[PDB]
Automatic annotation (TrEMBL), chains A, B:
EC number(s) per entry: 1.11.1.6
GO cellular component, one term: cytosol
Domain Catalase core: 16-403
Record has Heme as a keyword: yes
Species this chain originates from: Humicola insolens (Soft-rot fungus)
Protein name: Catalase
GO molecular function: catalase activity; heme binding; metal ion binding
Family as reported in the entry's similarity comment: Belongs to the catalase family.
GO biological process, one term: hydrogen peroxide catabolic process
Annotated residues for binding of heme d cis-diol 1: R59, H62, R99, F140, F148, Y349, Q353, R356
Cofactors named for this entry: heme
Length: 675, 675
């Protein structure tokens, strides 16, 4: 609605200045034809001044990201647990905007870096804008907001040379992790496949903190936000992620964009765990501690409604870059908790938009505006876009009849702090002892992964820690890893040539929890949008017929099909020169193209075979369609009897097998395990 | 050392606020131990406010870059051609700071994107700061500064989705190139190896524009700046660059940093072509036209002095990010020309620092300060650091005795405009007809590359244009390419499924010029700093002994040696898990490791062999040392008799052959050519 009035159409008409004067903008005004440019050329200067000033500071964290518009729909009337208006009726729709992100990388860094990921949702409710500023991992590195600059300095590039971009694989980061043991839980998550998701659509969103749901009668409950993907959970493998960072730094934002443009807008079930106030310390840890989850088995999920993203921005800068989220954007029916991480966040997000926007009127940016009337006595500031009629903007007043009126629990649907909340004791800068177990939950997480998944995590740690130059930091890292799992410490130690310390079993246990494994979460529930590369050739006209037949059968099922050949022509989407295994979720070679899989000026040596080999090694469904073709499989050293390897002459039988493979998504039997 | 007055040491002492009050910063102040955070916690708020506000806008162009300090030394007394003080004596030293960059990518994008590259040099002279803001390519896309936002909007990401990062491989860019034919010359350069340099040290720098040298007696000459690399010219191949974008986005800045830290600081001969004013239109084009070079044969290079970079920054942000170059930073003895591109730049660089710095006192930033006194009547502004004693800052004054004094041609060593310069004619927004030949010099450039080099350029074009979705744009691209070379248009057309238009020979010629070929610029003159990966194993104690012996022999000659094996231990630098062929200029397998070249939980399947195969296909010197070669060479499909393939038992004989290979740098026989 506020976005509508600000849309600007330039599909017709003559070029104007910003003040509506028709102009030209292609040649400077000069003193003679070979002469110097004139100062009086206002056309030149308004244009270049605009350009010179296009850039704004990137966000201090979550700089790299992308967004889309959509809709949230409540499944019910939730007034029995919260007064929140956007949740007060079956079927009620509220517009949203969501921005997904990495954390550590700058603008222009690669989508498929290993990192924590942001998932930020604005609900433009009929009682004000409500932001849930979440991550794809349910726990956070630190226990007090005052530590955030310490964390972020450590994981961002070394400040002498600004190396390395968008990576925790350097001394400073592991120095911090090894010296601040709270970090263990999030570190384990980030080193799992949760650090390299297949897409923004294939990860979940978490509020992380415990919040409160507050009823109109003042009573409250403690809650965790969970956004559960309806597309299923899925990851890249690390080697794939690295190549993909170079071949397509825009992989995640292109995936999101394309899914929306094809009518496959991603969906999430917006859910909570709800527990009584008396359960703050019932589960063997403290619900004020943002390094802990409530295990699935302790508190079930309640589905509140549906989040769907279904429209892409018109202007990335105006909408995506300028959207300014705040946990301070709260509505009646929600309240904060005394989580020391959350508490400090409230300050940060209000302050940081002054940096980004360069002035205090950032909530007037159309993407930031609400969809209800604004009544308040805030005035002036740079970039003030309103013209206020109330000339007595103070309370209390008689000269504007006491308007605007105070809103509170009993008037005007005012926000109110949960009336049960209290404080007692000295004013201290001390950590609660209830926050001290940094290791049990990391172990819970690790115990809940499948064997190959645990191997992947060990291999990510081996990769990163092997890049750490300081022997002391490496020792220190092993000391912390050892407190979570001796086994992990032994396995990682083996790769970096140190001895693991002796087992210290204080926090060791064998318990598991459901819902945190990617590998173990079963087949994807939909294969729409998944990418199938078909490797073909122009040399055999039968190869293009085989590709065409495959295309029709696969596209029928909503898969995105790329036929590859030496050169472009009708039916061919990409050349071998531009193609890569990171571009596909499954790879099919047509029989007719067998000759390519053994030199050409049109593509680098061995490219067709390399795509097939890479896809196989990265765990993808691969196959040959045509029938007499032990060839290609032989050339690739891919076993015909392999899980997730397909050979059929029949196109229909091939597609039916292959689609089951796409759902399985990764064939993990192809990865070696430690003894 | 050069900015030593501004350094802050934190290697001792207790934590303070910014106003020197000792504090803590690890725990928020709270109302009880499980209580909410207090607004009175000033420790929290000053720390988080600083953090929230760390970021500044990235540069509008050349956002991604890196810098170092050094020294310029004049070879002579140049007062006979220029009054410039920093050039007025044999042996005179001036400190410098240089920043290299890409153009289009945002600040965390990959060093090894295909792009134009910046080379910006500040001389902190004894008569003021003098900046030469150059590129690694001697010509620019456009002929008028007013077009710059058109060019940069077209090559930067599409503004609806902000895709794709750091790449010209999309519709908008080729739409612009095909509709603005001036772009052809720079386009050809960027599609050559000049678009993917091996390092900042292995490229040249160019002022691009014609400037003037002005003597103390008012006479002037026209000049082009050339910075000639003393390390030699060298390129990546495109497939290599793509992988390297993912494996090491920091490749160029790490290369520069390491070379400096190892005592191998890169050097350039700072040179000019000098011609009389009467030659402005003598060479068949206009010296005011920044799309044209002066061919080497038409005007020789004069070496003015030596630029050496030999000290790395202390703080990246404070020095590299905050350095604010301007072509407006000129000194007595230099002057501008009526180049409409240059002319507009002068406005832009003064204005844009207001965006970056947020305030007008950006020249007071330590990196921007001069090394001589400032006397002027500029006052106040946000961030004013000076405390001025002159309380009569106006001219003319008697109350400060007429100080500061006016400086000009005849007093105070004032800058002065070259007195011979004039203007004549109407005030016009028209393009000089002398600028109209957009195609002859692109053809000159292309004619001057070796056959494999021409193929590479064709292959870059094939790659990019094949990614363009609009058939109309592709047709339009072929129309412009055809005006440069029919052959080029035919070869590119073959990859994208279209017929090239009929030959239009208006601008076709067979002239060549020296010095623009990378392939043809002979062997590198030094191999110091080049990277040699030695692939070994921990399974065989003889393989590590072979590696150690190779290390000693190679390090003796200044090469950077990486021994790779399954795991880290004494003498092993990297694991196979972290190694890649993009990490090395040459790859050596020790024959004790032959068993690895045919699965492990410690690295991805086939990684050892993949490193060798990739290095070979990317044209690098590769070899097996020990005398048993055939097993490794067979598995890799590398011929023993191949150019740049080495097999010797003798360590000394192996190294002697291999080092000649490193100098050759690339073995171009391994790349297929079009019929
Ligand atoms: C004390 C500071 C601080 C602390 C403890 C955190 N953050 Fe934060 N976060 C910021 C300070 C901040 C910030 C500096 O205020 C940012 C950058 C730009 C912005 O709007 O706020 C930000 C951005 C930011 C974004 C990007 C929103 C967007 O797309 O624009 C997400 C998703 C999060 N954060 C999520 C979290 C989560 C889940 C945290 C812990 C549970 C968290 N942050 C702790
Ligand atoms: C009309 C605008 C315009 C035009 C025609 C040009 N530039 Fe520019 N250039 C800028 C506007 C600009 C700028 C927007 O004002 C920048 C951005 C950041 C800065 O400090 O200046 C810039 C940055 C910039 C940098 C980065 C300096 C650094 O590392 O900080 C280099 C090396 C160049 N340019 C080089 C060139 C060359 C060789 C050009 C043509 C021959 C050129 N620019 C034309
Ligand atoms: Ca570090
Ligand atoms: Ca995984
Ligand atoms: Ca400002
Ligand atoms: Ca209240
Ligand atoms: Ca485009
Ligand atoms: Ca080249």
């Amino acid at each position: 609605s506020p976005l509508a009035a600000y849309e600007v159409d330039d599909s017709t008409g003559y070029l104007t200045s910003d003040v509506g004067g028709p102009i030209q903008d292609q040649t400077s005004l000069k003193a003679g034809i070979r002469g110097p440019t004139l100062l009086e050329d206002f056309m030149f200067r308004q244009k270049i001044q605009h350009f010179d000033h296009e850039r704004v500071p990137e966000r201090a964290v979550h700089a790299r990201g992308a967004g889309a518009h959509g809709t949230f729909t409540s499944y019910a009337d939730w007034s029995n647990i919260t007064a929140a208006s956007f949740l007060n009726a079956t079927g009620k729709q509220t517009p949203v905007f969501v921005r997904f992100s990495t954390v550590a990388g700058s603008r222009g860094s690669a989508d498929t870096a290993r990192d924590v990921h942001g998932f930020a949702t604005r609900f433009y409710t009929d009682e004000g804008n409500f932001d849930i500023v979440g991550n794809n991992i349910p726990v956070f590195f630190i226990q007090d907001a005052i530590q955030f600059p310490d964390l972020i300095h450590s994981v961002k590039p070394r400040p002498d040379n600004e190396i390395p971009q968008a990576a925790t694989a350097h001394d400073s980061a592991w120095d911090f992790f090894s010296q601040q043991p709270s970090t263990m839980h999030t570190l384990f998550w980030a080193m799992s496949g949760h650090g390299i998701p297949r897409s923004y659509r294939h990860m979940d969103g978490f509020g992380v903190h415990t919040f409160r749901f507050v009823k109109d009668d003042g009573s409250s409950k403690l809650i965790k936000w969970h956004f559960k993907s309806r597309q299923g959970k899925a990851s890249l493998v690390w080697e794939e992620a690295q190549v993909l960072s170079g071949k397509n730094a825009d992989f995640h934002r292109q995936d999101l964009w394309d899914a929306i443009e094809s009518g496959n807008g991603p969906e999430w079930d917006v859910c909570v765990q709800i527990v009584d106030e008396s359960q703050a310390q019932a589960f063997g840890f403290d619900l004020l501690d943002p390094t802990k989850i409530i295990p699935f088995e302790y508190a079930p999920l309640t589905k509140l409604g549906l989040l769907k993203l279904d429209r892409n921005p018109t202007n990335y800068f105006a909408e995506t870059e300028q959207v300014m989220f705040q946990p301070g954007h709260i509505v009646r029916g929600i309240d904060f908790t005394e989580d020391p991480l959350l508490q400090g966040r409230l300050f940060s997000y209000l302050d940081t938009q002054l940096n980004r926007n360069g002035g205090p009127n950032f909530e007037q940016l159309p993407i930031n505006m609400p969809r209800v009337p604004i009544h308040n006595n805030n005035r002036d500031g740079a970039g003030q876009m309103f013209i206020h009629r109330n000339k007595y903007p103070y309370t209390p007043n008689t000269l504007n009849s006491g308007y605007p009126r105070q809103a509170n629990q009993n008037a005007g649907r005012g926000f109110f702090t949960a009336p049960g909340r209290t404080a007692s004791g000295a004013l201290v800068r001390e950590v609660s002892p209830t926050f001290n177990d940094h290791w049990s939950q990391p172990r819970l997480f690790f115990n809940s992964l499948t064997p190959v998944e645990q191997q992947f995590l060990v291999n990510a740690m081996r990769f990163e820690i092997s890049l750490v130059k300081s022997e002391e930091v490496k020792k220190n890292v092993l000391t912390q890893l050892n407190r979570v799992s001796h086994d992990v410490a032994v396995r990682v130690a083996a790769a970096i040539g140190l001895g693991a310390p002796d087992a210290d079993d204080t926090y060791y246990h064998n318990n598991k929890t459901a819902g945190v494994s990617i590998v173990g979460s079963g087949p994807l529930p939909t294969i729409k949008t998944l990418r199938v590369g078909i490797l073909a050739t122009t040399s055999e006209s039968s190869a293009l017929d085989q590709a065409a037949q495959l295309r029709t059968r696969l596209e029928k099922d909503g898969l995105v099909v790329t036929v590859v050949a030496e050169t472009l022509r009708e039916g061919v989407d990409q050349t071998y020169s531009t193609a890569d295994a990171t571009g596909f979720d499954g790879v099919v070679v047509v029989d007719g193209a067998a000759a390519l899989f053994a030199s050409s000026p049109l593509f680098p040596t061995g490219r067709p075979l390399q795509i097939f080999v890479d896809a196989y090694r990265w765990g993808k469904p691969v196959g040959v369609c045509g029938g007499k073709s032990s060839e290609v499989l032989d050339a690739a050293d891919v076993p015909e009897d392999g899980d997730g390897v397909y050979s059929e002459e029949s196109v229909d039988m091939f597609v039916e097998e292959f689609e089951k493979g796409l759902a399985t998504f990764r064939f993990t039997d192809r990865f070696a395990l430690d003894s």
